[PDB]
């Protein structure tokens, strides 16, 4: 029993974290095989971060301009290239701690674990979700760029996020491991702002199913609703619309609990209207939206890696 914001064991990612320093700028790198992946703005100095020309800045760079340190061993860079907003530094040594890995791009609502690092050393691990506005609500300070988000379902490490920058509201933006930003953000220190954030409805419903699986039932009701009526209510609370795909996604949880999806939707409408009135659901007084239906079945049924 019990439900926790569980992150994946971070060991397979710890063995890939290195420190990349160019000039006076330093951040974290991801050392897989003989390649080190890091955010490309490591090649900017102080006054080349507003409107940098990365192709031009990289051309002026030589291999010896990149100081890569894996612990106390300095890695010899033998090549460098750029793919979108990520920098690729070829070293002469393949990382012996390289796990079986994969590069994936995720959609909003997806969850992953973040290994926050500074100067190539792990500082902490936490769970987070790609918000509908393509930002994440992480915990990042200066020097945390290069920290990666990942999932380790089964035997393979799926890298899905690399951290780049922080937005004015304190939320964070980054790219996939191919350098493609999530959202319309750019790696420039120009005026940028995240759009209005919405609640991941399908994740709230999955988390309500997790509460029912864990024995909580006080929030259920005898009502059902149509998908259109539930959506018309949901937008009034800045909730993401529930699509028919989301209804299918919650199918297995609905079958396991014997509570139809639209039935659970009706209780979600009541919770938004009433609040929790001194009660908690799985140890929270807010509706949690950073647990996917996959996460719920993972934590409640069979956990292994």
């Amino acid at each position: 029993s019990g439900f926790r914001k569980m992150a994946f064991p971070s060991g397979k990612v710890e063995g890939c974290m290195v420190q990349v320093t160019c000039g006076t700028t330093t951040l974290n790198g991801l050392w897989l095989d003989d390649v080190v992946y890091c955010p490309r703005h490591v090649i900017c100095t102080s006054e080349d971060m507003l409107n940098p020309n990365y192709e031009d800045l990289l051309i002026r760079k030589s291999n010896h301009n990149f100081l890569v340190q894996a612990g106390n061993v300095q890695l010899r860079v033998i090549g460098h290239s750029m793919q979108n907003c990520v920098l690729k530094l070829k070293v002469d040594t393949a990382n012996p701690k390289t796990p079986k890995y994969k590069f994936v791009r995720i959609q909003p609502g997806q969850t992953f674990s973040v290994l926050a690092c500074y100067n190539g050393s792990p500082s902490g691990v936490y769970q987070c979700a790609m918000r509908p506005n393509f930002t994440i609500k992480g915990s990042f300070l200066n020097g945390s760029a290069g920290s990666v988000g990942f999932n380790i379902d089964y035997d393979c490490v799926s890298f899905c996020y690399m951290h780049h920058m922080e937005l004015p509201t304190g939320v964070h933006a980054g790219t996939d491991l191919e350098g493609n930003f999530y959202g319309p953000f750019v790696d420039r220190q120009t005026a940028q702002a995240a759009g209005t954030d919405t609640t991941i409805t399908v994740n709230v419903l999955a988390w309500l199913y997790a509460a029912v699986i864990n024995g909580d039932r006080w929030f259920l009701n005898r009502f059902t609703t149509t998908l259109n009526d539930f959506n018309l209510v949901a937008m009034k609370y800045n909730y993401e619309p529930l699509t028919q795909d989301h209804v299918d996604i919650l199918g297995p949880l609905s079958a396991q609990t014997g509570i139809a999806v639209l039935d659970m939707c009706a209780s979600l409408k009541e919770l938004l209207q009433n609040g929790m009135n001194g009660r908690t659901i799985l140890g929270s007084a807010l509706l949690e939206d950073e647990f996917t239906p996959f996460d719920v079945v993972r934590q409640c049924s069979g956990v292994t890696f």
């Binding site: 320093t21 000039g23 955010p39 020097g143 922080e166 964070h172 120009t190």
Partner: peptide, 12 residues
């Protein structure tokens, strides 16, 4: 407000 690229500073 400007975005902040969260690289770090290191003394040479």
């Amino acid at each position: 407000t400007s975005a902040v690229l969260q690289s770090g500073f290191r003394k040479m």
